[PDB]
Design a binder for this molecule. Sequence first.
Ligand SMILES: [Mg+2]
Ligand SMILES: [Mg+2]
Ligand SMILES: [Mg+2]
Ligand SMILES: [Mg+2]
Ligand SMILES: [Mg+2]
Ligand SMILES: [Mg+2]
Ligand SMILES: [Mg+2]
Ligand SMILES: [Mg+2]
Lengths: 103, 173, 173, 173, 173, 173, 173, 173, 173
Amino acid sequence: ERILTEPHASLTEQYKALMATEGVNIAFTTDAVKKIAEAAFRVNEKTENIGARRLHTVMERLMDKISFSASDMNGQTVNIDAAYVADALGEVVENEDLSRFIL
Amino acid sequence: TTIVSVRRNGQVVVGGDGQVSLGNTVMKGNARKVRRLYNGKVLAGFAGGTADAFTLFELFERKLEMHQGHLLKSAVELAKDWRTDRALRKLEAMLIVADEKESLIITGIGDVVQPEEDQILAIGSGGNYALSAARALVENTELSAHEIVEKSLRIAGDICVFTNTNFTIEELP
Amino acid sequence: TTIVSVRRNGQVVVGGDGQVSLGNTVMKGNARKVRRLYNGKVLAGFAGGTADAFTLFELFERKLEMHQGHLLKSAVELAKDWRTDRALRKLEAMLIVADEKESLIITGIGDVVQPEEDQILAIGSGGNYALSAARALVENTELSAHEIVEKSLRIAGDICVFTNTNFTIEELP
Amino acid sequence: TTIVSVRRNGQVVVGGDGQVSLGNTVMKGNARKVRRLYNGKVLAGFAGGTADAFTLFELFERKLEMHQGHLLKSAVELAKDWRTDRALRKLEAMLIVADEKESLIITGIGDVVQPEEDQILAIGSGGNYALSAARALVENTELSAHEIVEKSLRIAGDICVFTNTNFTIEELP
Amino acid sequence: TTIVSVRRNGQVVVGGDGQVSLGNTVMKGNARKVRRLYNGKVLAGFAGGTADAFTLFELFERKLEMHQGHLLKSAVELAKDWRTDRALRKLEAMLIVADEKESLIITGIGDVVQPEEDQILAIGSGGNYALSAARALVENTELSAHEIVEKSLRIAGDICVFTNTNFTIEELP
Amino acid sequence: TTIVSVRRNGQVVVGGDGQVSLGNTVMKGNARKVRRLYNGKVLAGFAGGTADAFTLFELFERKLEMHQGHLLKSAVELAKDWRTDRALRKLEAMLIVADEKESLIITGIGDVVQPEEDQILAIGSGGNYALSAARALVENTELSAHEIVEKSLRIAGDICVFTNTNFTIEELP
Amino acid sequence: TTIVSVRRNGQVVVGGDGQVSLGNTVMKGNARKVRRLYNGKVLAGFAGGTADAFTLFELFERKLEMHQGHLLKSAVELAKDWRTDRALRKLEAMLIVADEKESLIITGIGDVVQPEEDQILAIGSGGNYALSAARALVENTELSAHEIVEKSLRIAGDICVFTNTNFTIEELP
Amino acid sequence: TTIVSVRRNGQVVVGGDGQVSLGNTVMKGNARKVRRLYNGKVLAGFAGGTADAFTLFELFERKLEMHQGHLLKSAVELAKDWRTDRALRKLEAMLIVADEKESLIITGIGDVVQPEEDQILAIGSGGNYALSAARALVENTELSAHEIVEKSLRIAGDICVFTNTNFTIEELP
Amino acid sequence: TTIVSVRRNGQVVVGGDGQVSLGNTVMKGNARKVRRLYNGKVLAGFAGGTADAFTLFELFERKLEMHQGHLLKSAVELAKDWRTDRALRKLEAMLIVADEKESLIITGIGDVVQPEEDQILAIGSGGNYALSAARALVENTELSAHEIVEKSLRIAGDICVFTNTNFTIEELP
Ligand SMILES: [Mg+2]
Ligand SMILES: [Mg+2]
Ligand SMILES: [Mg+2]
Ligand SMILES: [Mg+2]
Ligand SMILES: [Mg+2]
Ligand SMILES: [Mg+2]
Ligand SMILES: [Mg+2]
Ligand SMILES: [Mg+2]
């Protein structure tokens, strides 16, 4: 959660500036940041753990839509809150299969 | 050697005897055949060739380390090393591994197997003796998983000549 | 085969599975391996060919006459001949006898064996499994000598591939 | 060799192949392995040397006299001697007998075996194959006890390399 | 272990028992010896060494993937790995594979074999027992391929000590 | 398995049975153990391990291809791969190969052998049985090479338990 | 089994464990392997089936009459028949006898063996271990002939997996 | 061969016989099976194949050298060479190693084992014989560790045919 | 084969028979099993497999050459090639080597052994026979080392069927 915003040029600050380029104004709520961090820590724990890199993977999966439609949304302002994140980050990565090899 | 594990009431236990025998003669009666792995958060008990057992154990530990210590995944990857062309030499030993989630038995030939329902595993020459006493104890008693293990091991020990009464019981709070 | 005997509260029970195998295939699943002898005063169980048994059951009747219905006297005698009589060493089997004061096991080799302070005996490939179940049940439960034998057969039969579920329980009186 | 027996609707049938092998080569394909005994009142089948059989068929006649044509009484008796009589344990073979009330199998080892509620028996290297065919046919079809045995021999003979197609079916009455 | 497959009426089925036995003792009775491969569009059942079977299975799956999932071609390429100088270690196991087009049995020694006419395959210790019951059922009944499989497996199970009644039947619509 | 070849009147024939047996049980009775190689201008029949036979066959075919399909030269080069330091694994199988010029038998151990005079070859368990019937037929009859082969195979089949009557006869016009 | 005998200060002691095993499993732990014979004048120990022993203990009584209670005369005689009498060579066991003037060991093979100037004898799988303990204890300590046998059994029983701790020490007078 | 070690009163001893036998014949009776390593500050005694023993010994010495001569660590690293994929050939021999701190026995199969309490080790055919005499001597005497070793070796030698009386005893002041 | 060596009075001799036998039949009776190495200043005699012996001999000769021909050092370096990981194939043969300083016997398994006192060595099937005659001759006679060798070889030859009378005796002035 802190890596997401505190550091100079954090991921949240980068995407804010990237979208601002297309004339879009975005803002992450405290709750939103918290879910992005939970999801990241969650998949590093259930699958392969890549550390803080996972944040990049998740943000990209989250900023997927806006990054594409930003040019068509000039002048607007987007609010990335809890709901926006729960929708964007679908549900539980992908299975957990492994019993295929067990007797 | 006898090793048995019972899981009930959110408690997991794995215990075993201490007799080490060379042929028909005993060498040591105080061996610890059950030990804790991965920051002491996973129980493991072994049976078979003294050297083969330790190497099966060790090989498994390296696995837990290369993963987030996930019992299942680890067991599957270790077993995969036998399911290839490079005929990874087989080990004449077996392991019982458990933690807060699952319980498995892994063999030096390359396969992983899960319990059945009553969450009971047992390996070694005296295995099936402790196994029966335990199934019985579980389907007709309210005894703790820790009590069932000690009681079944003792029983097994009074039947198998290669199983003594010097137990080592580990449980995962 | 699995024949187990449990004595608890003036009650002596003897039960057994009913599987007859020829190598690794089933020949018969509904078999009686426990018969009532000496005018329904002495229940016995066998683990071998019925004929082999019948030949020894009739002969235990004879020996039980030379001596006053003394199970032990009659037993110790049988085994003394089973090993000496050249025709008897032909018949290979295990024998379990009970009546009202004691239980025993007769072998075509060693000789008579009496129960411990637990009053339990078991023979047959699955014997030791049933034994383990019983010894646990009789030391931790209040189940009847009949409800115990009942369960022990189930447990053994599930581990031994030469034992089934068709039980022939013979109580007494 | 394959000898199978099926009883369905007061009808008792017994059929068998006719191959006589010496190691891995055929010696004779047209052989009678099912004979009519006790004044055509008791049909029997053998799986061994005809001489060995004849010696036991004549002896089953004798035992069937000591007792009132009681197939079982006579049978249980034969096996009691086959194992005790030193000359009889010389003859190795399998025996199947049927008459009008029951079917049986006599072994030079264990002893008599009665059919299940299906009334089917089979012996010989291909026995279990014929048994499997029959048990299915009698539980899913209305075919005659004779049309069943017929087919079962064909099926077995096609899987066993020691069984052929020349059948000797003996019905009754 | 027993595995059998029947193909009739545009329907393909492959089923098997669940008994896993170590020596003459059972370890698990609920194993799934039949599974779906290639996006669940091909049926596969295995028998033999627990580890060898899985590695034979796995090796085959990699094949289906390197082709458009064509059963025949895949079977032939896998078998080709045994028909060279590099003595690819042999596996003591066998596989039965099928789909909407064909049914084959592949062995860990390197050969592929097709049915005969009635489209019936069977492998394992109990194989030929289910095989007969099935041939019989197919040449004398109108029962579904799914019904024949379950009925034959059961039969086989009542004959082979290493085959239980906990089936896993897969069919390809 | 039985394979025999006769060459007379400018005609070359090579035929064989179809029985494939696993142990003492048949698996398939319609196998083609004789096939055409090199643009269908050379006859080849094999016996022995199902997998070893195919690999011996295949290895030989590659040879014919690396030469102008010359039977002799090919046989000699293939056999040369066993007569070196690199102990090319041996195959437990045998091949009979022929064409408009010669007839040879090649073994998985590395040697080539030619007929004797009557141009007759035969391999497999049933080989010598068809061999005699053929020598006899050739030194006392005017029967075609195609007739002799079919007649001898049949004979062989009635003697060897691993040789059936489902023949596959190939002749080279 | 372990039976050891030590004579020190007109005191002759004979003790033994009480374990009866069937292969590698315990059948009975509380067994008497040392009996009082010849009107409590001759203590003996056996290492075999009790029946086998009883048959030889009664026979040593007979031989001890033909000669004036002369342990040796009676012994040397028994072994002379045990090897000559065809029925006796059937009984395999080890025998140890002591009375008041000497100790001996009777074998169904070689023959009688007398102690050295140490007056110690031992038989049974664990014999040599008990022997080693005793020989050391009697040559470096002042412990009673009874306190020695006591310890020697403990030592042996701890090394031999076929010997336990339930001792049956028979002193004299 | 017999090798035994006792540690008491701040004294460590390790001694052994001198008989070298080829089959059932002696070759040399004055061999030194106990020697000093690492600047003569660690005792080592070996048993088993003459060549395998020396190579086990030598391999261990290289270890002590690559460390500060720490017995434990060295033993563990040597044993680790057997607990890997590279199946380091196994040696049919055993070593007993000791110094001012610990005593261990190492085997050519790859495992290290520590005493029990009385600090006594023994290996070789005559091992358990010296072992008993020593346990006995230690739990009932005040004899020096040097005296116990010589006395037990002698005893062992009078029992095992492959153990003579030409000892070599080394002690670490 | 028989080879013996005696060293007395500043004289060293090494001689042997000449019989070369294939199975139970002789092939040659005039073989030279004793030869001179290193500028004819070291005696060597061999026994065992004809090919293994020569290769053991040859391997040793290369050693003497890589050193100043020092018997001991050479023997130790050759033996070192067996005490490593690279399992240098073992040779089923033995060598007796001597010179003005020492006498040793080296085996194809990797160990060197020195005499005892009377400086006598002997290897081969007939070895111990010549050995006794020599020990005897040395501890009770004044006969030359050359005389003892010839006399003992002859004796050995009259006892062992694989040892003839065609000797080859070499001595080092
Ligand atoms: Mg025990
Ligand atoms: Mg069962
Ligand atoms: Mg057939
Ligand atoms: Mg079954
Ligand atoms: Mg045939
Ligand atoms: Mg013990
Ligand atoms: Mg000795
Ligand atoms: Mg001679």
